[PDB]
RNA sequence: GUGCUCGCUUCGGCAGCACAUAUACUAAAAUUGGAACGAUACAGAGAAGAUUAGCAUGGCCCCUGCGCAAGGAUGACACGCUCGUGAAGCGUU
Ligand SMILES: [Mg+2]
Ligand SMILES: [Mg+2]
Ligand SMILES: [Mg+2]
C-alpha cells in the first residue's frame with residue numbers, strides 16, 4: 001500500500017509539474033499543487049511551491065493570501 | 069513531379085469504405101442523432117425493444133426507423149387519451 | 153660523457169675545473185556506467201461524415217541538415233472556468 005501511495009503521489013506530482021510547465025503564468029495550477037501538498041502534510045514542500053509561485057508572479061493577492 | 073501539389077494521401081491507409089460500411093455508419097450516426105435529440109427533448113415515451121426497435125409507449129407504436137419515431141410528434145391526442 | 157691541467161704522477165687510473173640540470177593524462181591494465189534501436193511483443197496516422205494541403209504558437213522533448221534554409225504524421229506533446237452558507241472589519245440603533 002505504501003508503494004501504491006508512492007506511485008500515486010509520483011503520478012500526481014508529475015501531472016502537476018507538467019501542468020506548471022505547460023502554462024507557467026496560470027496561478028490556479030500553483031494553488032492546486034500547493035493545496036494538494038498541504039493536504040498530504042508536507043509543509044516545506046508547499047512552502048517551496050508557494051515561493052516558486054511568488055517568484056513567477058509576486059503581484060497576485062491570492063498567492064500571498066493562500067500562503068499566509 | 070510536383071510532390072507538394074499532388075492530392076493528399078498517407079501510407080498504410082486502407083482505402084475508402086464500401087457502400088455497406090458507409091450505409092451502416094450513416095445508420096449508426098442517425099441513431100446517435102435521434103438519441104441525442106430524444107435526450108435533449110427528454111421524452112419518456114421512447115423505448116428500445118429487446119429485439120432492438122423503437123417503441124412509443126404513450127402511443128404504443130413500433131417504429132422501423134429512427135425518423136419514424138422522429139416524425140411521431142397523432143401523439144398529442146394519444147398522450148391526452150393515455151393521460152387519464 | 154667530452155675536453156684540459158704550472159696536477160698525483162704513472163703513462164692505466166685518481167683528483168680538480170668547464171659544458172651538459174628535471175620526460176610522462178605517468179598502463180603493455182584492473183576497474184567503473186552508460187547505451188544504436190534492430191528481433192519479438194505492446195502498439196496504431198490532427199482538424200465534430202469520409203479523404204486530406206498545411207503554416208505557426210510554449211519548452212527540463214528531440215532527430216536529419218553547414219544552416220538566421222528546409223524537412224522529420226501539420227516532427228511529437230501541449231483544454232475547462234452567473235447564488236447561498238459562514239468568518240473578519242466598518243457606520244446606525
Ligand atoms: Mg474528419
Ligand atoms: Mg512544407
Ligand atoms: Mg516543420
Ligand SMILES: [Mg+2]
Pocket residue numbers: none
Ligand atoms: Mg509531409
Ligand SMILES: [Mg+2]
Pocket residue numbers: 076
Ligand atoms: Mg499531411
Ligand SMILES: [Mg+2]
Pocket residue numbers: 226
Ligand atoms: Mg509543428
Ligand SMILES: [Zn+2]
Pocket residue numbers: 113124126127128140142143146
Ligand atoms: Zn407517440
